[PDB]
Design a protein around this ligand. Sequence first.
Ligand SMILES: *[C@@H]1O[C@H](CO)[C@@H](O[C@@H]2O[C@H](CO)[C@@H](O[C@@H]3O[C@H](CO[C@H]4O[C@H](CO[C@H]5O[C@H](CO)[C@@H](O)[C@H](O)[C@@H]5O)[C@@H](O)[C@H](O[C@H]5O[C@H](CO)[C@@H](O)[C@H](O)[C@@H]5O)[C@@H]4O)[C@@H](O)[C@H](O[C@H]4O[C@H](CO)[C@@H](O)[C@H](O)[C@@H]4O)[C@@H]3O)[C@H](O)[C@H]2NC(C)=O)[C@H](O)[C@H]1NC(C)=O
Ligand SMILES: *[C@@H]1O[C@H](CO)[C@@H](O[C@@H]2O[C@H](CO)[C@@H](O[C@@H]3O[C@H](CO[C@H]4O[C@H](CO[C@H]5O[C@H](CO)[C@@H](O)[C@H](O)[C@@H]5O)[C@@H](O)[C@H](O[C@H]5O[C@H](CO)[C@@H](O)[C@H](O)[C@@H]5O)[C@@H]4O)[C@@H](O)[C@H](O[C@H]4O[C@H](CO)[C@@H](O)[C@H](O)[C@@H]4O)[C@@H]3O)[C@H](O)[C@H]2NC(C)=O)[C@H](O)[C@H]1NC(C)=O
Ligand SMILES: *[C@@H]1O[C@H](CO[C@@H]2O[C@@H](C)[C@@H](O)[C@@H](O)[C@@H]2O)[C@@H](O[C@@H]2O[C@H](CO)[C@@H](O)[C@H](O)[C@H]2NC(C)=O)[C@H](O)[C@H]1NC(C)=O
Ligand SMILES: *[C@@H]1O[C@H](CO[C@@H]2O[C@@H](C)[C@@H](O)[C@@H](O)[C@@H]2O)[C@@H](O[C@@H]2O[C@H](CO)[C@@H](O)[C@H](O)[C@H]2NC(C)=O)[C@H](O)[C@H]1NC(C)=O
Ligand SMILES: *[C@@H]1O[C@H](CO)[C@@H](O)[C@H](O)[C@H]1NC(C)=O
Ligand SMILES: *[C@@H]1O[C@H](CO)[C@@H](O)[C@H](O)[C@H]1NC(C)=O
Ligand SMILES: *[C@@H]1O[C@H](CO)[C@@H](O)[C@H](O)[C@H]1NC(C)=O
Ligand SMILES: *[C@@H]1O[C@H](CO)[C@@H](O)[C@H](O)[C@H]1NC(C)=O
Ligand SMILES: *[C@@H]1O[C@H](CO)[C@@H](O)[C@H](O)[C@H]1NC(C)=O
Ligand SMILES: *[C@@H]1O[C@H](CO)[C@@H](O)[C@H](O)[C@H]1NC(C)=O
Ligand SMILES: *[C@@H]1O[C@H](CO)[C@@H](O)[C@H](O)[C@H]1NC(C)=O
Ligand SMILES: *[C@@H]1O[C@H](CO)[C@@H](O)[C@H](O)[C@H]1NC(C)=O
Ligand SMILES: [K+]
Ligand SMILES: [K+]
Lengths: 633, 633, 156, 156
Amino acid sequence: RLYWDDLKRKLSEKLDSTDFTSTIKLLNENSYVPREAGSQKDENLALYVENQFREFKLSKVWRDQHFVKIQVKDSAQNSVIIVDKNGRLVYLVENPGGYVAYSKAATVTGKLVHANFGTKKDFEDLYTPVNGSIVIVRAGKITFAEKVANAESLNAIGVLIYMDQTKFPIVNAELSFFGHAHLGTGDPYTPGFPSTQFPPSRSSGLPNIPVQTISRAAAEKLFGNMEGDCPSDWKTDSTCRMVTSESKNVKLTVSNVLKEIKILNIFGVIKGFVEPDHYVVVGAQRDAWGPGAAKSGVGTALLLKLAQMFSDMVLKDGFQPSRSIIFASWSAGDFGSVGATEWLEGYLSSLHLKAFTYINLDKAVLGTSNFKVSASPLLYTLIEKTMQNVKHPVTGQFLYQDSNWASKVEKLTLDNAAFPFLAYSGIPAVSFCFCEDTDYPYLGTTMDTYKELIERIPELNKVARAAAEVAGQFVIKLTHDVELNLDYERYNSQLLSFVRDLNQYRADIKEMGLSLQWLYSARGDFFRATSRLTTDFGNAEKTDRFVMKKLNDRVMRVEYHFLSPYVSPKESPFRHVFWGSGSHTLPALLENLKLRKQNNGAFNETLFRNQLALATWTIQGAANALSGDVWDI
Amino acid sequence: RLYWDDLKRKLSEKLDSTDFTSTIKLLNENSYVPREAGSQKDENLALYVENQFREFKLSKVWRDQHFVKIQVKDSAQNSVIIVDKNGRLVYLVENPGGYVAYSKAATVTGKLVHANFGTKKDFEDLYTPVNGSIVIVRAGKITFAEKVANAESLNAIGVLIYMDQTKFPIVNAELSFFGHAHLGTGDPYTPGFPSTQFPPSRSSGLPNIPVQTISRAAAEKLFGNMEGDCPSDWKTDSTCRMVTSESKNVKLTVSNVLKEIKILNIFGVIKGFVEPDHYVVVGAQRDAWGPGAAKSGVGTALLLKLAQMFSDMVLKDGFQPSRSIIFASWSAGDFGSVGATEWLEGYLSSLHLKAFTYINLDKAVLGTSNFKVSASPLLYTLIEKTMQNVKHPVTGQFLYQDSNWASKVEKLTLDNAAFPFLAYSGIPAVSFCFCEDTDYPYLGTTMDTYKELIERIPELNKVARAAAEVAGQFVIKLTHDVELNLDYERYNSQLLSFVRDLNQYRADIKEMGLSLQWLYSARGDFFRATSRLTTDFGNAEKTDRFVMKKLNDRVMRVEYHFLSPYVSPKESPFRHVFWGSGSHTLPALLENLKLRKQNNGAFNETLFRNQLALATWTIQGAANALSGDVWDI
Amino acid sequence: NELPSLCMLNNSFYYMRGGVNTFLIRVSDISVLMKEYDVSIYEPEDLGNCLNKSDSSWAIHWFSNALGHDWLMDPPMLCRNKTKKEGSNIQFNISKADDARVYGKKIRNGMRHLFRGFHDPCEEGKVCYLTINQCGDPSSFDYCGVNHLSKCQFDH
Amino acid sequence: NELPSLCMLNNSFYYMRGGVNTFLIRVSDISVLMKEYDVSIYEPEDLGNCLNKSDSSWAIHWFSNALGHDWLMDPPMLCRNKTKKEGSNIQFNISKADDARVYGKKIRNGMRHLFRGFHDPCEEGKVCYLTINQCGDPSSFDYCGVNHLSKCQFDH
Ligand SMILES: *[C@@H]1O[C@H](CO)[C@@H](O[C@@H]2O[C@H](CO)[C@@H](O[C@@H]3O[C@H](CO[C@H]4O[C@H](CO[C@H]5O[C@H](CO)[C@@H](O)[C@H](O)[C@@H]5O)[C@@H](O)[C@H](O[C@H]5O[C@H](CO)[C@@H](O)[C@H](O)[C@@H]5O)[C@@H]4O)[C@@H](O)[C@H](O[C@H]4O[C@H](CO)[C@@H](O)[C@H](O)[C@@H]4O)[C@@H]3O)[C@H](O)[C@H]2NC(C)=O)[C@H](O)[C@H]1NC(C)=O
Ligand SMILES: *[C@@H]1O[C@H](CO)[C@@H](O[C@@H]2O[C@H](CO)[C@@H](O[C@@H]3O[C@H](CO[C@H]4O[C@H](CO[C@H]5O[C@H](CO)[C@@H](O)[C@H](O)[C@@H]5O)[C@@H](O)[C@H](O[C@H]5O[C@H](CO)[C@@H](O)[C@H](O)[C@@H]5O)[C@@H]4O)[C@@H](O)[C@H](O[C@H]4O[C@H](CO)[C@@H](O)[C@H](O)[C@@H]4O)[C@@H]3O)[C@H](O)[C@H]2NC(C)=O)[C@H](O)[C@H]1NC(C)=O
Ligand SMILES: *[C@@H]1O[C@H](CO[C@@H]2O[C@@H](C)[C@@H](O)[C@@H](O)[C@@H]2O)[C@@H](O[C@@H]2O[C@H](CO)[C@@H](O)[C@H](O)[C@H]2NC(C)=O)[C@H](O)[C@H]1NC(C)=O
Ligand SMILES: *[C@@H]1O[C@H](CO[C@@H]2O[C@@H](C)[C@@H](O)[C@@H](O)[C@@H]2O)[C@@H](O[C@@H]2O[C@H](CO)[C@@H](O)[C@H](O)[C@H]2NC(C)=O)[C@H](O)[C@H]1NC(C)=O
Ligand SMILES: *[C@@H]1O[C@H](CO)[C@@H](O)[C@H](O)[C@H]1NC(C)=O
Ligand SMILES: *[C@@H]1O[C@H](CO)[C@@H](O)[C@H](O)[C@H]1NC(C)=O
Ligand SMILES: *[C@@H]1O[C@H](CO)[C@@H](O)[C@H](O)[C@H]1NC(C)=O
Ligand SMILES: *[C@@H]1O[C@H](CO)[C@@H](O)[C@H](O)[C@H]1NC(C)=O
Ligand SMILES: *[C@@H]1O[C@H](CO)[C@@H](O)[C@H](O)[C@H]1NC(C)=O
Ligand SMILES: *[C@@H]1O[C@H](CO)[C@@H](O)[C@H](O)[C@H]1NC(C)=O
Ligand SMILES: *[C@@H]1O[C@H](CO)[C@@H](O)[C@H](O)[C@H]1NC(C)=O
Ligand SMILES: *[C@@H]1O[C@H](CO)[C@@H](O)[C@H](O)[C@H]1NC(C)=O
Ligand SMILES: [K+]
Ligand SMILES: [K+]
């Protein structure tokens, strides 16, 4: 067993002589260049990664194979067409190079209406009714899946998406791009039974309208046939317009088809010396529509180098992780973390007893200016201590520069592979990156190349190196300390913050005959439960692996006990009342209640009483799950 | 640490000199005699039990207090009245001494129709339509709650229940009796929030019709005014008739009221020496409507004597239980294991990680002829080995006399406190008793006295002694062996049996475009998972408490992983796909499918495809949860 | 005090007043007592255990005889044990059926003598009873309140 | 081989035949090309990169001149780069709007000379274009199939 100081030094010095850019460049070679999930090139890289793991001599390397239905574009072209309502003659504007996976295959003709980013707010602020019209929106702010849903929610009949030059200062205006519009993760077409025969989807999260990505040039050509200046508030090109002329409307034809593919998740593992049946999981997306250097290459490179380093530290330098470290190369990430989700779904309710943390490595390097982090609050302390002794690659200062960084942390979103881990599986998760206030413009394009990457970021090797150090320090701390570096006390602030918000309606809870007393008591009981647990840790003999096991297991279950037990994972997979999606999340409870100031019928008093109940029960349950022995109350 | 042979002898010889009848008699004294839940006498006994635990010097004794809404009868009498449709003059037949908790408070007038036991089949076999009529049924076969539901299901407007002399050869025909008709357990009026204000119940399982218990005399007086002989198939009194005369119908008035009561669950614990945070739980119902000697006294007596014995074995004789033993005196058992359920509900999803077995002691002594057992299959082996060395109190032969007893075992029913443990909490449970082919007639009456008990069973002390030995041997085995005596392999037979049944429709699964392949694979995977686990146990060093802990924890989770993860415990608490209630249980899947031979619209093809899916997923999940490390597949 | 006095309200309600006590008298095909479970009255003294106060058995004694009932010869009438909470209910079986045919003829004859305009509701082959409940007992329901009893102008 | 021959089907479809190639010609207020992104034709030779075969640029060359287009003097027409998959699309801006007013007058004059019965759909102040797609290209859709082109009886 080594000292944390030595492990820190060892990791750092191994990192010093590590060549990241070579690997990123290597992954950008023609053997791997265009690696859409399931393709032979994806399969090539999968084989290469797998071989590398074998050369690193990890305890065991294996395959997690899955068959899934994705959507690819048909031999028939998707098309964007302008129609003259006079005589109904059509003019072809574009056959897009790209497409949007999970779009309804259909042909729709209507008026075209701009809706900015297609955010929920953008739609309400519209002075043009979207109903029965095709909508065009800029990429960014929110996922394609959300834009489609918001629009579909207002009865739009189709969606176009372009990259405006203000948000995406790309010289080539003919660039086409890719994404998906499945409002979830995993395979949307997952019949619980094999079939020839065709069953409907139900609560799939799939679009019922066609959605399609277009080049900025094609959008500006569409603007050429539209009227109305865009609000300066949108801060967009002067090109932009709002609505088709009276005599014209647009026709969209999407003919994407379902294809079944064989994806491979490639796994390596360094077994733990004390509790090998518990693991930290480190993963990266291996697939990409185009070259996907930043989208896929960076992550896969870090995955490979981290795997190599830790294998060397165990075999040469005497590092002895208490718990196991699993390295995961995912496929079909581009379709909604499909690879990751399929694997997660094998262990719906059991995984949280083995995996205590997931570290995502996707898009860790996109810029230089900033260091962003999204994570479970359970990892805020680990993250903080890690930023306090990792240096900025350009700047030289420690990453930790703001004592208040934790309150400004944004939550994991659906397009992040870290999301299903936290919100569906109840495993604390963290994603982080070096970046700007600007999205990396080339993501999802054929311009996401190494050359492009090394050009916007000439210090690529140093920056990737800093990204590896944070992930590496995470992984060491997590498998070295006898306690788990999961700060369960953090959820007191979260509950406090939530009740603090809720208490801004102590009046409206009166006019409904409701007391919030049982909820306050749940919050109090959780506080007590954490306090008792901290005391127990302090009074425990750190060398007694039996008592630590027992205390650590309690910590490992905190996250999962915030998954609502009162909703089916099939109907709503994202059960986490803090971080998931649906009417069972604390945020939903607040939004339903904010709709009570308006005397409009949007408020749903009944729903709220149920939400209040389920929340209280969930929180009580978590407090009770943490308290320990049934005679201690 | 002692040898199993010594523990067996010690238990037996302590039992030899134990006086059971004295305690049963003591509990039948006026200080405790009529002890309805929440009453002062119930509270007295609660205090006495609690004191006794303190004298036994258990590791810790404590209270689990709950406030619950029960129903008691009003100062206004319930009445059964005959009406002359000519002139509408009424004649009072009875003001019942007893009542049925959870009956709708209401007054209803209609025709009276006999429906035997009110079983689902009894109703279909009726040549008289129950719709809009009051129904009268015999007690027995099924719970009151089921009778009401079945009747309510056919639109009956009220229910009378009597004890016919054939099933209940009681001399006094004026005897009144008690029960409840809540189709579940726990408090039915559990608002997730405190209120003055009144919220509706929803999926409560509460009757919407009045239900009332009547004396056999009152029933025969009703028969006096009815026509039509009863089917000899019912094997009932010649008194019985089927329908009111043309000119007459019956009026039922129930005016029961809701009362909030303070119940006490009294707990004692003998702490485990190795894993105290894991427990076997032994419980008995302390409350009863009348004297409840058999209903409540026997169980409470065994609870007290068992607690005393084990305390002596730990302190004097050197017994050192690995895991803890908790003794539980429940209240409001008579209302549907309310006490037990309220406590269970504090630990919805966490309890199965601490309690690995529940042993119910209720009504363990009712007769002499037979020994009956109902339990999780996980305890069949323990039960068998225990019957193989416990002797029949009268007979002298070992209880084990039928090599095939396990296939004839009936499942826990709703009126058993062991039920919520298994089906709601996922904790293996067992109830057992010495009894006849006949129900104990005096249950729920004022005739359930010690004197009555000691009269039908003069060997009471010896029989109670045998009941304590089985429970005691259970408890010793369970806390002594280094492995858990939970036979997880048993669920292979269960799955086999179920698929074996399902395979009797391999044709109908074709005509629906469905393959059963993924379900077969789940069953196979569970088999593999158990086989691997047995191998692991064999290869483990029995003296390594770390590896055993890990293997035992896996065994402790088997039961819970059969709780369906796809249904809310609030909507359907009994989630166990083998043993719970609802459309998510394997039995439900079969019944829906048996409804496909009839070309009637009762079959629900859609539902079945969902059932097939959820079952497959549940079973796969359990197999995956048992397989261990994610790299082992 | 004289002897008991009688009144008929309509065909559904007859009433006897004995001292400070009043009794509801009805005739219908409904029975609520049975030999097996209730009190058989073989002699007048037995009436004592049918009423709250054993001494107002007098009015029922007088009434039974006035009706034509022969204690030594006739089927005992039944009555609800005074202790039950129902409570009072004396029941004569006057069915136009074989076993009780001649007796029923007789009692109804009595009713015709006592209440001019007595209506015979009893049907051939069907069962039929004469029932007495003391006003105030639960078994008299509201049949002896203002809208009934006070509307009856007593004679006798 | 003569020079290209022309036909008008109705007011929505005009067609030119040049050797073995046919072209759809339309006039409407819809544009799909822009200076910023498509090919500007300053001289006839430039037409080579607008069509699958650089040598059938001839018919469009002849047609532009026949129309009155002055290569040296007039606004360059735009065309879709031959390499794009749309593909062929030559676009003349004949808007009755200030910048292109006089030029548009002229082209429409040409259209009147070439197609007797040419209908002017262009509106004052509004935008308007003349568009040519080679039959067979995706941008010609089905406009050159049997129900259209074969119904047109060619002259010239
Ligand atoms: C008040 O007094 C009445 C009269 O005393 C009493 O009611 C009688 O009770 C006895 C015994 O409980 C019943 O006797 C039984 O007779 C059984 C067969 O009954 C049938 O036959 C009857 C006779 O035939 C009649 O009908 C024809 C034409 O229809 C006619 O010409 C005849 O003259 C004759 O009147 C018949 O009346 C009877 O009618 C029934 O019909 C309907 C019910 O569906 C109803 O409207 C009637 O009221 C009546 O119920 C019926 O059709 C016979 O099987 C039975 O024997 C049992 O016991 C013996 C014991 O020896 C067993 O061995 C055997 O196996 C049987 O189990 C029994 O003898 C008699 O029917 C009743 N009479 C009536 C009119 O109902 C009341 O109980 C008294 N009340 C109280 C509270 O005490
Ligand atoms: C094909 O050719 C046409 C014509 O050449 C070309 O369309 C023109 O494009 C230019 C530049 O893109 C436009 O010029 C802009 O003018 C802006 C103000 O436009 C308004 O005013 C116009 C003039 O007034 C007219 O109306 C009155 C009475 O109504 C009349 O008496 C006048 O004679 C005169 O005709 C007006 O025509 C114009 O009309 C619009 O109305 C609707 C749209 O809502 C539509 O039906 C019309 O087609 C037209 O769009 C409008 O009301 C001016 O702000 C702008 O300046 C910008 O750029 C400068 C650069 O110096 C910036 O500094 C400044 O900040 C602005 O951002 C610009 O000059 C002109 O309006 C177009 N003409 C028409 C008729 O549309 C097409 O683009 C060509 N096609 C292709 C593919 O190349
Ligand atoms: C009238 O009722 C009393 C009350 O006894 C109660 O009601 C009976 C119907 C039965 O339910 C008993 O169990 C109840 O105790 C009777 O008095 C009883 O008489 C019996 C027999 O003589 C005697 O054993 C009991 O001790 C008595 N009980 C009391 C409280 O005194 C009485 O016999 C009934 N009268 C008739 C004529 O039936
Ligand atoms: C017509 O298109 C060709 C094809 O280039 C492709 O399409 C262009 C619009 C743009 O998308 C390029 O990125 C594509 O490669 C053009 O040929 C290119 O010309 C440029 C500049 O001379 C040159 O750098 C490239 O190497 C050429 N590419 C190839 C494959 O030869 C051509 O310039 C376009 N013609 C006109 C007049 O616009
Ligand atoms: C032109 O003629 C063809 C052939 O009938 C017809 O199909 C088409 O609709 C016509 N177009 C217009 C605009 O009249
Ligand atoms: C949208 O809604 C309004 C009101 O229901 C309706 O009048 C209008 O026609 C709709 N618009 C379209 C294009 O469908
Ligand atoms: C509000 O919620 C309740 C209960 O969930 C539901 O019955 C009702 O339909 C909802 N109303 C709306 C506007 O959806
Ligand atoms: C008898 O008279 C009273 C008083 O009017 C009335 O209320 C009652 O309904 C009558 N009963 C019958 C059967 O006529
Ligand atoms: C029961 O159902 C039938 C058919 O719907 C109806 O005719 C009958 O009146 C009902 N019976 C009663 C007593 O409500
Ligand atoms: C059968 O089940 C489906 C899905 O659960 C449901 O939609 C339908 O209403 C059901 N039919 C009946 C008869 O209840
Ligand atoms: C008979 O006694 C009971 C209880 O003592 C009383 O409630 C009732 O009024 C009495 N009956 C009469 C007719 O007074
Ligand atoms: C132009 O070339 C493409 C591909 O080579 C071909 O599909 C198309 O038919 C050609 N255009 C014409 C008008 O023949
Ligand atoms: K170490
Ligand atoms: K021991």
